[PDB]
Symmetry: C3
Subunit: 143 residues, 3 copies
Amino acid sequence: ARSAFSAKRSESRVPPPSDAPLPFDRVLVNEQGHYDAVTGKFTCQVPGVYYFAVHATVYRASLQFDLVKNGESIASFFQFFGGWPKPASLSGGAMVRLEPEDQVWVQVGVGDYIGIYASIKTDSTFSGFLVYSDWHSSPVFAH
Amino acid sequence: ARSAFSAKRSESRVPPPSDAPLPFDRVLVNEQGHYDAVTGKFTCQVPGVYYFAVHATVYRASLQFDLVKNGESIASFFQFFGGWPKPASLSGGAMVRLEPEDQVWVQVGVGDYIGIYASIKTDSTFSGFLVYSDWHSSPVFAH
Amino acid sequence: ARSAFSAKRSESRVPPPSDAPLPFDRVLVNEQGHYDAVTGKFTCQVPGVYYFAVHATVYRASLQFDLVKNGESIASFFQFFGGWPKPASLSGGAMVRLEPEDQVWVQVGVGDYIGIYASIKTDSTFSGFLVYSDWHSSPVFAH
């Protein structure tokens, strides 16, 4: 089975959509259309186990984010921004089992900490892909 | 073939098991049981090439960790903790070829540097998965 | 289909090759020979969607790097080095669609910022792998 996407944040002078999925509005690859660049949500169509990774630039404020499945945090990440003149970085990742129509997204989970960033020479990316399908070959006999 | 897992660290007031595998005791997904959340070790059952990734929170002390195969470091990672009021972050990852019964785990490789952390809004995750199997289709004729 | 590699940087007292691919000269796994440890370039032989990840140690200078496809940046990453006594860290990653003979590599994209590092207990790794092939099963009828 095939399911994969990767997207990055556009540069922005406004604060990032918070307490809601964070859109990564600039798509690198989304052949199945399983990622929605308007909403920032990945929607599952193939049941299976997936890897998700965020590689973020942090600037002007600390960054906290959650990887979220169906409104609940899978895993949470944080990088302190110590008032430095140039950006820092934060990556997070996890695997999760999904069923069709389950949704996964990135969300800032605490108020102050929305320092995610992108610029000419920095980016913040969100990627996800199916590692194996849970439609097994002998679905009735075994499993 | 199928082999994947992902797990995270529980919050702890005690120092992390060191000079021994680091348990990530809270399992996100381990359908084959190839990861052992008690020991922190992944044990291979399908020969092949695997990706492993650690996404760690760092707090109160710097963090050094090794990704280890059969007791020897594959790759080593480090993040300085500059006495900041809130956590920093450290990710590491690599691919490795494994044969059945090979074991992979995370270990703190230097004494002082055991600042791995988890809390209400931070986590440290360990994930791994088979990318392709080395049981080829024409195993005798070629390869 | 099978395509994967992972490699790490050797310790060096000289500045890293810049404005050119960065060699990760120490190979962990490259069964297809799709990665060239001499040039630092991955060359595609199977069309499909790939994940690439860099997990770098940063020391003595800030680090900027781009993940590059055919001479153009896919995504750019940065970590400030605040003059600390010990290293910091920077990870970056993205997915991209490739066709045979396309090349992917890591490059430092800005002059001052070449603080990538490796030592006895730190590494910088570059990994990439095919997630799914774009040689579909019904290539004419559909797609």
